[PDB]
């Protein structure tokens, strides 16, 4: 089997991408944030505290003839940005882009933190990291990809995120028309539950490539590119007037600036992030200070190849027995 679904930016900055997902029978379509940095499929629901729902579409398990309470199961998750959610668990039929999994754990939120309530465009998350990170207790549950893997033509999914435009998540096949050149594959460590890999270096603009190992995670659920402070300083030093602002929470730059590109290495290959992808616009409406899309990871504990980096590439998440990641230009 295969699936193919379009993913759409939630706003004009590509802060996140939503993908329609069919849950239950008859289908209830919710727009979920596909997150290769986490492993829970959770939704706003008829069980979510009413004051914490503000415009999201909810899953109502009592209206699905295929929903079954997973008795005793609870979940609770906290994300790197400090947001969180928790609840109980149903199993139900879940379909993405024509690919159907029966018996998928659908984690129904009883509580969500304010950042989720305040974003009416995201009805929940669909985790695509390794199932060892799933938070369901006392019986850990498998991700949608893990449940689908055996049925897929090939045990892979691909992320082709757009810049200020829709893109595609494919399951079970690699669309050879969606990228240019060849795909360069690189080793993955699953020891922390992430799609963790080592970039071979970077370049700033037209500068020379610096060969240096940068361990990080491919994370579609993170907006920005978070790299070591040395690398980030070298980038922003090429933008006149750019500075790190403690009050804003990262590097800002004059909105009048033209940003240089940023290149990252994948083996001997190179992925070029155009400068425009690094512009996240005014820090507040009407400001002439703009927020940078490359930020320091120093306070995170891990480097994160988020959407800023991933949308410059066609990215293969190869879930074979020994997982690997593939990157191609597009």
């Amino acid at each position: 089997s295969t699936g193919s679904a379009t993913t759409t930016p939630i706003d004009s900055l590509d802060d996140a991408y939503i993908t329609p997902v069919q849950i239950g029978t008859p289908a209830q379509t919710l727009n979920l944030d596909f997150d290769t940095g986490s492993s829970d499929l959770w939704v706003f629901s008829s069980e979510t505290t009413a004051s914490e729902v503000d415009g999201q579409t909810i899953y109502t398990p009592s209206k699905s003839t295929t929903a079954k309470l997973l008795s005793g199961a609870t979940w609770s998750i906290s994300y790197g940005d400090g947001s969180s959610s928790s609840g109980d668990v149903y199993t139900d039929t879940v379909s993405v882009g024509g690919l159907t999994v029966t018996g998928q754990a659908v984690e129904s939120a009883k509580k969500v933190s304010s950042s989720f309530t305040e974003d009416s465009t995201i009805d929940g998350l669909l985790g695509l990291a390794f199932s060892t990170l799933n938070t369901v207790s006392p019986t850990q549950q498998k991700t949608f990809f893990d449940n689908a893997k055996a049925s897929l033509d090939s045990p892979v999914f691909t992320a082709d995120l757009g810049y200020h435009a829709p893109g595609t998540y494919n399951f079970g096949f690699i669309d050879t028309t969606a990228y240019t050149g060849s795909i360069t594959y690189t080793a993955v460590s699953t020891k922390q539950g992430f799609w963790e890999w080592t970039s071979t270096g970077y370049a700033v603009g037209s500068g020379t490539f610096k060969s240096t190992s940068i361990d990080g995670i491919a994370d579609t659920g993170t907006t920005l590119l978070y790299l070591p402070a040395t690398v980030v300083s070298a980038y922003w030093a090429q933008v006149s007037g750019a500075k790190s602002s403690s009050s804003v929470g990262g590097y800002v730059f004059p909105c009048s600036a033209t940003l240089p590109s940023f290149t990252f290495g994948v083996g001997s290959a190179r992925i070029v992030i155009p400068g425009d992808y690094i512009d996240f616009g005014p820090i507040s409406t009407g400001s002439s200070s703009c927020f940078g899309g490359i930020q320091s990871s120093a306070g995170i504990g891990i480097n994160i190849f988020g959407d800023v980096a991933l949308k410059a590439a066609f990215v293969v998440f190869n879930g074979a027995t020994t997982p690997t990641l593939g990157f191609a230009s597009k």
Side-chain angles (χ1 to χ4, degrees), residues 1-62 64-67 69-109 112-141 143-148 150-190 192-242 244-330:
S1 62
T2 63
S4 181
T6 297
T7 194
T8 299
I10 63 164
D11 61 25
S12 65
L13 297 180
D14 299 344
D15 281 315
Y17 297 79
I18 47 173
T19 306
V21 177
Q22 282 72 49
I23 311 179
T25 308
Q28 302 178 37
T29 298
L30 274 66
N31 295 329
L32 303 189
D33 185 350
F34 283 23
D35 181 13
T36 61
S38 69
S39 305
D40 288 49
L41 193 176
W42 73 261
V43 296
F44 279 81
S45 75
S46 56
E47 303 183 327
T48 310
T49 300
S51 68
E52 297 179 349
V53 184
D54 185 8
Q56 295 80 11
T57 296
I58 63 167
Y59 169 61
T60 303
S62 64
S64 173
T65 60
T66 44
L69 179 72
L70 186 62
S71 185
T74 60
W75 63 279
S76 180
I77 190 159
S78 304
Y79 296 101
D81 61 359
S83 67
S84 63
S85 53
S86 61
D88 55 14
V89 186
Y90 295 82
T91 55
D92 211 338
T93 303
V94 173
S95 301
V96 176
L99 169 64
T100 299
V101 166
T102 58
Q104 174 65 45
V106 177
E107 303 172 33
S108 167
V112 304
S113 65
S114 58
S115 59
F116 289 114
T117 299
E118 289 162 5
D119 182 4
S120 68
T121 73
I122 291 175
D123 302 325
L125 268 63
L126 189 150
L128 292 166
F130 294 86
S131 292
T132 53
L133 296 179
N134 176 264
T135 78
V136 176
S137 180
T139 306
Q140 191 170 60
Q141 300 295 303
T143 69
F144 175 83
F145 177 55
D146 239 339
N147 281 323
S151 310
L152 293 176
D153 291 355
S154 181
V156 304
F157 70 89
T158 65
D160 179 5
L161 299 180
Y163 168 63
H164 293 174
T168 304
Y169 282 102
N170 290 330
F171 292 83
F173 71 105
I174 292 165
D175 180 356
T176 62
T177 74
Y179 58 88
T180 63
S182 52
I183 306 178
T184 296
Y185 288 88
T186 196
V188 164
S189 172
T190 62
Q192 295 193 97
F194 301 118
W195 293 91
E196 186 172 1
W197 65 290
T198 303
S199 171
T200 49
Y202 70 97
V204 175
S206 59
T208 63
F209 187 85
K210 175 72 170 178
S211 295
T212 183
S213 294
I214 304 171
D215 294 340
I217 66 168
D219 185 0
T220 57
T222 291
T223 313
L224 305 185
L225 174 53
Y226 293 89
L227 293 174
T230 47
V231 178
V232 175
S233 184
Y235 178 80
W236 290 109
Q238 298 306 311
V239 180
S240 187
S244 183
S245 167
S246 58
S247 60
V248 174
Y251 280 89
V252 298
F253 66 96
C255 294
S256 59
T258 298
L259 298 180
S261 63
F262 184 87
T263 300
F264 65 94
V266 182
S268 55
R270 305 292 181 251
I271 299 295
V272 179
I273 303 170
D276 285 354
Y277 290 26
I278 299 162
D279 183 353
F280 278 74
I283 60 172
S284 291
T285 302
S287 179
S288 75
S289 293
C290 274
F291 197 70
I294 296 178
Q295 296 295 343
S296 178
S297 65
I300 295 176
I302 195 157
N303 300 304
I304 306 174
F305 294 85
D307 297 333
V308 164
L310 303 181
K311 72 192 180 180
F314 177 88
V315 189
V316 180
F317 294 81
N318 168 29
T321 301
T322 296
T324 65
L325 280 165
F327 291 84
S329 294
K330 65 187 183 189

